[PDB]
Subunit: 73 residues, 2 copies
Amino acid sequence: SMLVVVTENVPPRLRGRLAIWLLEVRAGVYVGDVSAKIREMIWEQIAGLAEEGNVVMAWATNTETGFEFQTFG
Amino acid sequence: SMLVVVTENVPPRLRGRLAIWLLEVRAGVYVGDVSAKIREMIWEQIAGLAEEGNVVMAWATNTETGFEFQTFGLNR
């Protein structure tokens, strides 16, 4: 499912890990199509590594709304 | 399909029009599930209004990549 991650003021290590799975299309804006399991891995890395940064994750779902999101920071 | 729009340093007028269709979940980060027709309207507004700012659109597609995107503005 499509996943977008938008970062601000996060440590370089998190930026690098996001880039394992996602394409950085603009500084701090990452996009990809990843499984639910990889999405949960990404959620975990953001929660653990964002420090004082701000992050938004948004991903496509087969629900009525059609997406879900989470903010961090 | 799912559409995300990320804006930086754009006029307030664009910010308001994006909210016609999309949910602003953080300042400058908009999300929704909208038709291709609505997405094209959004494309047109971003292109016409971004001015000195920077915008990214990303949307879900039925392709192997699974998404497409477009950047707009001063510093692509």
